[PDB]
Amino acid sequence: EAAAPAGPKEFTEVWNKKAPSTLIVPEFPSNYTAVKAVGEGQVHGDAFPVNFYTPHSILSQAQKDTVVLPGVDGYFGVKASHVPTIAQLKPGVVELHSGAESEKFFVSGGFAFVHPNGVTDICVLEAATLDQVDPAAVKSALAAASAAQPTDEFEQAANRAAIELYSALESAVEAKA
Amino acid sequence: SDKGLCGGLNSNITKYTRATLATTESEGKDVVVVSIGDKGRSQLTRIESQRYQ
Amino acid sequence: APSGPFYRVAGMSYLRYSNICADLLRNVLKEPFKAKAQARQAIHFRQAPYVDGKAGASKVYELENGIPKTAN
């Protein structure tokens, strides 16, 4: 039921009454986005724009044809027009495909969106390519993870997160292509 | 900001704070005012002190 | 008390959970790349709850090793 249409152009009607006219209207983050989700398009064939993001770095903004994301119910591939999906990702390998070549970023979690206008968005917190990872340090930390047993389940909420991140990192490079 | 030699930055959004806050609070609702940067803790605790947590 | 995922039933937020997974990925990187990890991992800020306009003293975070994985 839509009797309360909040919005950026509808913020200005109440702002022209209580707030004075001495200030210009404050900006909104929607005014800086050229791409939305509800206006269809952006596919034009077999490609779709993929925006792979960390908080500290924009890793990709090109157009791919296959994106393999490590969802919490397992890996899944995204073709040109996937179903609109909000998929929570576990630690695993985000795999991009523009053609015959593939780049394999290992991510630590964070969600992944597929939008009804065909655009997709991968939103992680730390994404290291596997050439930046060395396996000698990985399961030595799992040897420090799955051995200590604190019954405080705030620490084995972190230790469960430590186990599934390191163990998915071992098979990320031991199952090399 | 934290150091206050910026010259009109931290005062401008405290004008834009109450121009946005009083626009959206006319229903008798709860409001918590937070500030990031100690130039706001010298500027917002004198204009909105009853709602500064 | 609450339900949801394994971090949410422990009182751990998603931002604390996804950061605990984040820096634990940064701990096992190669040393040319792990040098660029504790820069974006350090937490250096302070806070003060204002009850009536009079704070208290402080709560200063000076951690250079990430978000606290201990209880909170």
Indicate the pairing of strand A120-123 with strand A48-53. Answer: parallel
Burial A116-130, CB ≥16 within 10 A → b, else e: ebbbbbbbbbbbbeb
CA distances from C32 to C14, C21, C26 (A): 30, 21, 12
Q: A44 with A90, same domain?
A: yes
Partners of residue A93 on adjacent β-strands: A106
Is A20 inside any structural domain? no
Q: Do B19 and A15 touch (CB under 8 A)?
A: yes
Q: A56 with A101, same domain?
A: yes
Q: A129 with A163, same domain?
A: no
Q: How far is CA C40 from the centre of its chain?
A: 12
Is A11 inside any structural domain? no
Is A84 inside any structural domain? yes
Which residues of chain B make contact with A11, given a CB cutoff of 8 A? Answer: 23
Q: A97 with A110, same domain?
A: yes
Q: How far is CA A112 from the centre of its chain?
A: 4
Q: A102 with A118, same domain?
A: yes
d(CA A28, CA A62) in angstroms, rounded, equals: 25
**Tokens coding B19:** 């121009």
Q: C28 lies in which domain range?
A: 1-72
Is A4 inside any structural domain? no
Residue found by looking up tokens 């992944």 in the block:
A112
d(CA A79, CA A76) in angstroms, rounded, equals: 10
Q: Do A154 and C11 touch (CB under 8 A)?
A: yes
Give the other-Cβ count within 10 Å of A40's Cβ.
Answer: 12
Q: A169 with A123, same domain?
A: no
Q: A141 with A114, same domain?
A: no
Q: How many angstroms separate the CA of residue C14 from the nearest CA in chain B? A: 22
Q: How many angstroms separate the CA of residue A124 from the nearest CA in chain B? A: 25
Q: C29 at the A interface (CB within 8 A)?
A: yes
Q: A86 lies in which domain range?
A: 37-133
Is A81 inside any structural domain? yes
- Given in angstroms, what resolution was this structure solved at? 2.9
Confirm if A124 and A96 have CB atoms less than 8 A apart. no
d(CA C12, CA A135) in angstroms, rounded, equals: 29
The technique by which this structure was obtained is cryo-EM
Q: A59 with A127, same domain?
A: yes
What's the domain count of chain A? Answer: 2
Is A94 inside any structural domain? yes
Is A16 inside any structural domain? no
d(CA C7, CA A156) in angstroms, rounded, equals: 9
What's the domain count of chain C? Answer: 1
- Phi then psi dihedrals of residue A22, to 5 deg: -70, -30
d(CA C69, CA C16) in angstroms, rounded, equals: 8
Q: A41 with A124, same domain?
A: yes
Helix ranges (H only) for A17-63 are: none
Greatest pairwise CA separation for chain B in angstroms: 38
Q: A120 with A160, same domain?
A: no
Which residue type is seen at B43?
Q
d(CA A25, CA A23) in angstroms, rounded, equals: 6
**Tokens coding C26:** 């940064």
